[PDB]
């Protein structure tokens, strides 16, 4: 069954203090989906509809996709949304896990809901990251901006440490996307 089979929309308000009722954890800087902390009963101000378990992955806020962004960016999206907040979330378990590296290696059927979400998440991560490659710099490119130009040795150290969320190969070189900085 689909990665997105347990996806649902829960609707919440912020409390008087402007807080959600739960903490946000994870984020691309940690190589993760944004996901909820503990959801204690009573602490969240729901409007009618579906409710949240602890540690659900957060995919969208008010139809802005946030999976693949850093926690800072997620909080920035939330700060510019008006109540009520519509959260698209999915509980962890089975194939659904907060690890972005594992997720971005999953292969979904072209055109599926699962595939479309994975593309949206990749687009989000790409907004926040400079890719690395082992291919040499060419005329017109800016190191640090278009690519981080690194050696194979360096690229494999990053792979080994889990610092690359996505990688591939093309014409005899390695390409990948590192975790974005926290800030």
């Amino acid at each position: 069954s689909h990665w997105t089979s347990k996806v649902h929309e829960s609707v919440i308000g912020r409390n008087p203090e402007g807080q959600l009722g739960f903490e946000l954890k994870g984020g691309a800087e940690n190589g993760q989906f944004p996901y909820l902390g503990e959801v204690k009963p009573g602490k969240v101000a729901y409007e009618s509809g579906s409710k949240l378990v602890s540690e659900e992955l957060l995919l969208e806020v008010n139809e802005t996709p946030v999976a693949g962004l850093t926690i800072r960016d997620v909080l920035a999206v939330i700060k510019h949304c008006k109540d009520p907040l519509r959260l698209k979330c999915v509980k962890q378990g089975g194939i659904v896990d907060k690890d972005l590296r594992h997720y971005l290696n999953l292969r979904f059927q072209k055109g599926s809901v699962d595939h479309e979400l994975q593309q949206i998440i990749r687009d989000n991560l790409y907004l926040r990251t400079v890719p690395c490659t082992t291919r040499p710099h060419k005329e017109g490119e800016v190191p640090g901006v278009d690519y981080i130009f690194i050696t194979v040795e360096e690229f494999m150290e990053l792979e080994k440490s889990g610092a690359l969320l996505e990688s591939g190969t093309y014409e005899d070189n390695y390409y990948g996307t590192p975790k974005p900085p926290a800030e």
């Binding site: 292969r107 687009d123 790409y126 907004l127 890719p131 490659t133 996505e166 990688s167 591939g168 190969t169 093309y170 014409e171 070189n173 390695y174 390409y175 990948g176 996307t177």
Partner: peptide
């Protein structure tokens, strides 16, 4: 954002 070569390297 990403170039054609990058997207061909990683897309599956």
């Amino acid at each position: 954002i990403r170039s054609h070569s990058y997207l061909r390297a990683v897309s599956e």
